[PDB]
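Posted in: Structural Biology > Protein-Ligand Complexes

Title: Requesting predicted complex, chloride ion in pocket

I'd be grateful if someone could produce the 3D structure tokens for the following input. Sequence and ligand are given below.
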Amino acid sequence: GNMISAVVAAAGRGSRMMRDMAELGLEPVHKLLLPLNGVTVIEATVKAVLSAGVDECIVVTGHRAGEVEEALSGMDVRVVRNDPVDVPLSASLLRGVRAAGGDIILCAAGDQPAVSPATLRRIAEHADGSTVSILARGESGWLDNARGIGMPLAAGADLLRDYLPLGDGNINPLLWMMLEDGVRLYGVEASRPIELVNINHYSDYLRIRDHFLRTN
Ligand SMILES: [Cl-]
Ligand SMILES: [Cl-]
Ligand SMILES: [Cl-]
Ligand code: NA
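-- Reply #1 --
Done. Output follows.
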């Protein structure tokens, strides 16, 4: 409880979403660079994380890093690039955690821009050295499963440094590993289910954009 660092994973490909755009006869745009709220998806995500009151925000870049970094160029973030770039989400998070000063890390997906600052703040507040907190698929409370969950989450930096090097690369298998090991996982109910939407398909982006257009 001395310092909270955010790590935003903004380094991955999003081939499915780009193909979706091509299949609509649109020019594909990488998910993080799609327009949202007068800015880009990635700027929206970072703004939410900073608005959650973290002491610093690390952003991990890789895929199309030049463009993602240019999108963020006005923002108060510390950028670290994956090199080599072809690493999975867990490795991107690890690179970010390596760059973070804090004892608690708030891990967020760059492509999940509808999480509110208030939800992120609640997630960060429930983490400690031995407790992982996470955006829940349903109601708040202790979790005995990791169905339908992944990001954002918060955890002790030492705990993340022990778990992130393990597994296949995806976050969800690590959460199941943690539960098997007896790690306490606390689910925080989303303000709105839109907060759970990561941009995998173009339809996910349109769903988020529609929410943003409604709420200004
Ligand atoms: Cl918008
Ligand atoms: Cl770097
Ligand atoms: Cl701690
Ligand atoms: Na499509």
